[PDB]
Paper text:
In Coronaviridae, including the betacoronavirus SARS-CoV-2, the causative agent of the COVID-19 pandemic, the macrodomain is part of non-structural protein 3 (nsp3), a 200 kDa multidomain protein encoded as part of open reading frame 1 (ORF1). Evolutionarily, these viral macrodomains fall within the MacroD-type class, which is primarily composed of (ADP-ribosyl)hydrolases that are able to cleave the protein-ADPr bond. To this end, we obtained the crystal structure of the S2-MacroD bound to ADP-ribose and its analogues ADP-HPD and ADP-HPM (characterized as potent inhibitors of the related poly(ADP-ribosyl)glycohydrolase (PARG) enzyme). We identified and characterized the structural basis for the observed functional diversification of MacroD-like enzymes and provide for the first time direct evidence for the hydrolysis of PARP14-ADP-ribosylated substrates. These data suggest that SARS-CoV-2 contains a conserved, enzymatically active macrodomain that can potentially counter the host antiviral ADP-ribosylation process catalysed by PARP14, as well as alter poly(ADP-ribose) (PAR) signalling, thereby enabling viruses to escape the innate immune response of the host.
In order to identify how sequence alterations affect the structure and substrate recognition of S2-MacroD, we solved its protein structure in the presence of the reaction product ADP-ribose (ADPr) by X-ray crystallography. S2-MacroD2:ADPr crystallized in P212121 with two ligand-bound molecules in the asymmetric unit and was refined to a resolution of 1.57 Å. The resulting structure of S2-MacroD:ADPr follows the previously observed fold of a tightly packed α/β/α sandwich with a central six-stranded, mixed β-sheet flanked by six α-helices. The ADPr ligand lies within a deep cleft on the crest of the domain. The two protomers deviate only slightly from each other (r.m.s.d. of 0.091 Å over 149 Cα). The adenosine moiety lies parallel to the protein surface and is partially shielded by Phe360, which interacts edge-to-face with the aromatic ring system. The amino group at the C6 position is interacting with Asp226. The phosphodiester is interacting with several backbone amide groups within a loop region spanning the edge of the binding cleft (Ser332 to Phe336), which was therefore termed the pyrophosphate binding loop. Two characteristic motifs contribute further to the coordination of the distal ribose, first, the NAAN motif (Asn241 to Asn244 in S2-MacroD) lines the floor of the binding cleft and Asn244 coordinates both the 2″ and 3″OH moieties of the distal ribose. Second, a triple glycine stretch makes further contacts to the 1″ and 2″OH positions via the backbone amide group of Gly252 and Gly250, respectively.
Residue numbers in the entry: 206 to 379
The structure:
């Protein structure tokens, strides 16, 4: 039974959020697509990318190395679909801007646009961790950009509560 999401809070007609770890969710939900928050060389570091890769026993990194050897690096805001291995049917690797290095935060719109090629996705908040974007800003861009069904896994309970509170204020406009 694929895409068996449960316990999400509905934010908009197509964006849902849950205080959960993205790997544990993938194991529970068996999603068609899980989203990786990637860099342009698909060298999977210490955030979601490392978590997903470790859960595939490094199969994600070997596949990514093979992709890069054939195709070269991605562009910021770009994506590629590879295997989801034991976690999902497919993994959508998306490159958000690295705001810590001064890349353009507006490319987060381009990054989330990639979600619109998939009916339903399990995803993290792009650029909001190692890449240093404000998590509330990443959620705002997600809500304004994605039209397909996005289930957001936010593992930190304090961040989750902060995101919901900030989302409500922006939506009500006070
Ligand atoms: N296991 C997890 N489950 C859910 N959310 C998570 C998890 N780990 C981190 N997060 C949260 O998801 C958001 C995404 O953070 P990152 O994974 O660091 O993604 P990003 O900010 O885009 O940085 C990308 C960079 O990090 C490396 O892992 C990756 O190879 C790339 O270079 C952050 O809010 C982070 O706290
Ligand atoms: Na929750």
């Amino acid at each position: 039974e694929v895409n068996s999401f449960s316990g999400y809070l509905k934010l908009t007609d197509n964006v849902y959020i849950k205080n959960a770890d993205i790997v544990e969710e993938a194991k529970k939900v068996k999603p068609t697509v899980v989203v990786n928050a990637a860099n342009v060389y698909l060298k999977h570091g210490g955030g979601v990318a490392g978590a997903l890769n470790k859960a595939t026993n490094n199969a994600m990194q070997v596949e990514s190395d093979d992709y890069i050897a054939t195709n070269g690096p991605l562009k910021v805001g770009g994506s590629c679909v590879l295997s989801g291995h034991n976690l999902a049917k497919h993994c959508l690797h998306v490159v958000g801007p690295n705001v810590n290095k001064g890349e353009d935060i507006q490319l987060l719109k381009s990054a989330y646009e990639n979600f619109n090629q998939h009916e339903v996705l399990l995803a993290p908040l792009l650029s909001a961790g190692i890449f240093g974007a404000d998590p509330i800003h990443s959620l705002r861009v997600c809500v304004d950009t994605v039209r397909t069904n996005v289930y957001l896994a936010v593992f930190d309970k304090n961040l989750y509560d902060k995101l919901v509170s900030s989302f409500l204020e922006m939506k009500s406009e006070k």
